[PDB]
Design a protein around this ligand. Sequence first.
Ligand code: UDX
Ligand code: UDX
Ligand code: UDX
Ligand code: UDX
Ligand code: UDX
Ligand code: UDX
Ligand code: CL
Ligand code: CL
Lengths: 164, 459, 461
Amino acid sequence: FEIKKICCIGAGYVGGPTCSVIAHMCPEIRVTVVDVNESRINAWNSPTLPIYEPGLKEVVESCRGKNLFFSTNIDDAIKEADLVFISVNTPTKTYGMGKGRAADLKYIEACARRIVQNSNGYKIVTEKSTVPVRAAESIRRIFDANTKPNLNLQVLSNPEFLAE
Amino acid sequence: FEIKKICCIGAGYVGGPTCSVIAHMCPEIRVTVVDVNESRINAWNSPTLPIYEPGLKEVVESCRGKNLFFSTNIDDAIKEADLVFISVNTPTKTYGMGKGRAADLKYIEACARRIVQNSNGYKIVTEKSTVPVRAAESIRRIFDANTKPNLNLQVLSNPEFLAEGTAIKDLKNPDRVLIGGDETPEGQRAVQALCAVYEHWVPREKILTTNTWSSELSKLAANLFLAQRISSINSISALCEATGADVEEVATAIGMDQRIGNKFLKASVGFGGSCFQKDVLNLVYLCEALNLPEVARYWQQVIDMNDYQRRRFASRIIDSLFNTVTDKKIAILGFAFKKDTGDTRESSSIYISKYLMDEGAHLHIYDPKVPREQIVVDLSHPDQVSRLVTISKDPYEACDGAHAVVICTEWDMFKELDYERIHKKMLKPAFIFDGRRVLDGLHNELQTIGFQIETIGKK
Amino acid sequence: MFEIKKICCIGAGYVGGPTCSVIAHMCPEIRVTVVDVNESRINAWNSPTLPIYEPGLKEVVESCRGKNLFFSTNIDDAIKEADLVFISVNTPTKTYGMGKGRAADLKYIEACARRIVQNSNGYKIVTEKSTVPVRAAESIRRIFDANTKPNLNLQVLSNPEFLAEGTAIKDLKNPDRVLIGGDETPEGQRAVQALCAVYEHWVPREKILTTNTWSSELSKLAANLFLAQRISSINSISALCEATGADVEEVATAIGMDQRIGNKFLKASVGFGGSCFQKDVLNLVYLCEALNLPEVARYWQQVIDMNDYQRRRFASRIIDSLFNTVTDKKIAILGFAFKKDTGDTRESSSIYISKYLMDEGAHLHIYDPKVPREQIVVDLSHPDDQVSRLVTISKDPYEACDGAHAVVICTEWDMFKELDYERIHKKMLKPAFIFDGRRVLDGLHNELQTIGFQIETIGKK
Ligand SMILES: O=c1ccn([C@@H]2O[C@H](COP(=O)(O)OP(=O)(O)O[C@H]3OC[C@@H](O)[C@H](O)[C@H]3O)[C@@H](O)[C@H]2O)c(=O)[nH]1
Ligand SMILES: O=c1ccn([C@@H]2O[C@H](COP(=O)(O)OP(=O)(O)O[C@H]3OC[C@@H](O)[C@H](O)[C@H]3O)[C@@H](O)[C@H]2O)c(=O)[nH]1
Ligand SMILES: O=c1ccn([C@@H]2O[C@H](COP(=O)(O)OP(=O)(O)O[C@H]3OC[C@@H](O)[C@H](O)[C@H]3O)[C@@H](O)[C@H]2O)c(=O)[nH]1
Ligand SMILES: O=c1ccn([C@@H]2O[C@H](COP(=O)(O)OP(=O)(O)O[C@H]3OC[C@@H](O)[C@H](O)[C@H]3O)[C@@H](O)[C@H]2O)c(=O)[nH]1
Ligand SMILES: O=c1ccn([C@@H]2O[C@H](COP(=O)(O)OP(=O)(O)O[C@H]3OC[C@@H](O)[C@H](O)[C@H]3O)[C@@H](O)[C@H]2O)c(=O)[nH]1
Ligand SMILES: O=c1ccn([C@@H]2O[C@H](COP(=O)(O)OP(=O)(O)O[C@H]3OC[C@@H](O)[C@H](O)[C@H]3O)[C@@H](O)[C@H]2O)c(=O)[nH]1
Ligand SMILES: [Cl-]
Ligand SMILES: [Cl-]
């Protein structure tokens, strides 16, 4: 199996620069970064990136429009991708059990369900973050319970060691 | 002296059914049930009774208008009665000394004063309730201080042992009748007259007589022994969940010991109802006045364990949903504290709901007999309810698009639901949290459908 | 699939002894051998005077001993020959180390398991039988799994014993239910059914419960808790009755008529004794520590705390009635066994009440119709100088009461209600006190008061 299309749910400090380098180093792979914040997505396609990272401006503009793309169309990007990165934020719970300490997995859970909603065939789903707290288990429990014919989703863990 | 006219102040779960069965068994006795709640009295005289009780409608309509009557005319009912029952509620004090533990005897004191105002001659005043906390004494203090010429009021204690949902069967065939009275010629005459009423359908060997205090203390102890059986088997259920056993199979081995008995050994989310928790709190407060801290902390554990059982069940629900429940639909099946009643007082369904509401869950509650207005008042503080709580018309609307189904009341209809239809419309993974062991024997079918079934005392 | 024709039981005590005697009496075609490391106890089983007092036990043993029932110190051979091996040894509480004073010491059960492996070839069924099975089956299975041999096939079953001392013969002949635990495998099913066939000689099939070994042990643990809790609950009520002017016996009658509660085990007392209940609560508490269940441990801990409180309150009432000074005062202690119709004194409330009185300097004169005199000395000498100065063992109740200030009844021996209390009162010092810790003198208070006694009983003013 060979990965030729990559989607990334989350265009923040992690998913943004990671996919920009992947697209820069893998020119034969189409890299599409998606995000729910349209203002952030527009900035990624603008001459003023939403985050300041030394050298990021040169890497993105070196392949944006060639094999690196930023879009708000989350559904179709997942539909075509062979590898789907999940690089969303997991805030700390503000109430309930674990208030102020436990992470809130509602965004990772929504990404897992939205992947099932727009996936057919074989796909590799990978969670990439700097603080992964039971993320792979949460994604796997959703995929095991929402199965389709000839639907084969794989769950990988690939933490990101980059420092801003 | 023959008791021929009975009046009962209080047309609730105790006084209402009790007087209906008395009038049913004693056709020659006029029984008048009075209450301050006019809408409740009107319901008693309507085809739709204010409380749901199996068989109560058939018993009421067989004698209502003949020798059973319901009225708001408290004064004349007292004046014409030979026997006066006091079956009102005593709420726990919300402030002052004993806040949250002590009972408030203002209603019983108010009844005793109103009885004196409308009484002449000889009457028998009998306190009848499930939690008689120093009731006969307080009635006696008022009568002894408000005397009229030729006014001779006798004070008796007659605790009611019925359980809601089975009140009719309990009243018709009680295990025993407990009557307390003074150890005087007058007290024994009063006690004997009350025994003659029960002898119309209760055998003599099942009628116990004692003094008023020993009567109330026996009732209180009996309630403690009952609640303790539930908390003990619930503590075993936590032990079963942690070690791989089934509390239902363990309760079977325990109950076959005839010294223990096989009753009241059903593990659950926690006991509820107006009797047991209050009874334990009154025991605790009583021991504070008597300086019996060792006795108080002994029985306090019955409440502490019941609260732990409730909290553990709610935590298993929250844990199964990735510790995040915000904007997740959850179905609550059953809101009464037990099946075959509409009463919600101290129901575990209230506490489980509040625990889920504090996590941001959108609750859809169904109960076949509990009215929707009662559920709203229970969940509302004396904002969250308007945002998170929906009252469903049928179980399949509450389970539509839900993450988990939570069974809190052992309604027999819940084991007859179309769970293939529920599973198709639920979000996956679909959880069933059986807090009453009602879906036992259906687990293999529920697992084949695709459910993640979690129950008490079993993994 | 397998039939038991020969039985060995390691442990010839209050559990193993009577149990095998009834089994041998009900199954004349099965050879039953009771073995024990204690030779003096084994010699007593083969004598006209049995080592334990149990009503009806003498008639059962003498009916089949020497025919199909045997007692011996030859543990190894008994094992070799046996189809089925019972393990009915004691498990004392650890006196040091992790779980000091709470956890069970499984060294004897482990030693039995290794001994079994040593003398076993082929197929045998090893069944653990005791009133307090604390993780016993798992410990035996772990030793068997690690010591395999060619053609060796040992099975491990759990079979808790529900008998109560004083009524063991009646309990064993007509049990409320038989509990047998075994692995949910073909091997375990064969072993369970084989043991069921033994009980089916006199126990109806509908009273034989089968499950796995852990659920079996957990059920026995829970059953003993419920029984002990009933005693502590009614004893908590006896404290309320004393403080408010009621009688616990009357309250207990009104409680017991509720068929959901039952009228058994509602007899208030000075406190429960015996080798099972206290031990069971402690084992549950320690088990909850390993399972991280402190709420469950806290809940059942109150059964012990209430029992210790009931004893202290009874001793305090005795000391209080004697001007809070009992130095050089003679006090009669009637009854030292933990219950009537037995000589067993394990955890008897009589020991605790005596030690509270000895701490006041009381001169105790103890009488019990079945407890041997040496056992009382050992019980009170447990860590004697204080026993030598204060303790006297009497041969009759009138000797123990001669010149005493108080009479303390700690055991419900029926003979205590037939004593000549006029003779006792004449030779007692005034005021003469009778402390009924068992309610055995109910109905006699009018007579005893007329004679001139001060009657103080549990659960009444
Ligand atoms: O459901 C969601 C949630 C989040 N997102 C997007 O994910 C992006 C996250 O941006 P952030 O700058 O917060 O993310 P980061 O890349 O810095 O992640 C880092 O910080 C937050 C931690 O919880 C993460 O584990 C860490 O990797 C946002 O643009 C948000 O719109 C979605 O597109 N969908
Ligand atoms: O010597 C130091 C280093 C760092 N710091 C402080 O520690 C904080 C973290 O600095 P980092 O450069 O590690 O910051 P980052 O959060 O970008 O990266 C960190 O989290 C994500 C992980 O993947 C990175 O490996 C980890 O370094 C900064 O506020 C920095 O000022 C010090 O105070 N002293
Ligand atoms: O002053 C008063 C107070 C109360 N009442 C009536 O007494 C009735 C009490 O009925 P409830 O259903 O509340 O009470 P129950 O019959 O269930 O009693 C039970 O629960 C409450 C406990 O405090 C009681 O001790 C117990 O018996 C109410 O209808 C109330 O209107 C009066 O008529 N006058
Ligand atoms: O085995 C059981 C029994 C009961 N329960 C729970 O305990 C609560 C009380 O149930 P009960 O049937 O005792 O109901 P009630 O409260 O109506 O009656 C109780 O209080 C009044 C007394 O006079 C009755 O004798 C007593 O049973 C219910 O929530 C029930 O679900 C269990 O969880 N398990
Ligand atoms: O290694 C050993 C240990 C013990 N034994 C024997 O096992 C017998 C134990 O009998 P006991 O009378 O002490 O005990 P019981 O039969 O009353 O058992 C009861 O009390 C003690 C608890 O730990 C047991 O779990 C309970 O069943 C003793 O006779 C002892 O000699 C052995 O033969 N070998
Ligand atoms: O109503 C009662 C019953 C019992 N007790 C006391 O509780 C203690 C235990 O009495 P039991 O008759 O239960 O005696 P045992 O210890 O022999 O049996 C107990 O432990 C072993 C288990 O197998 C038995 O099922 C259990 O009853 C005695 O000291 C007895 O006096 C009371 O104080 N009141
Ligand atoms: Cl909220
Ligand atoms: Cl001393």
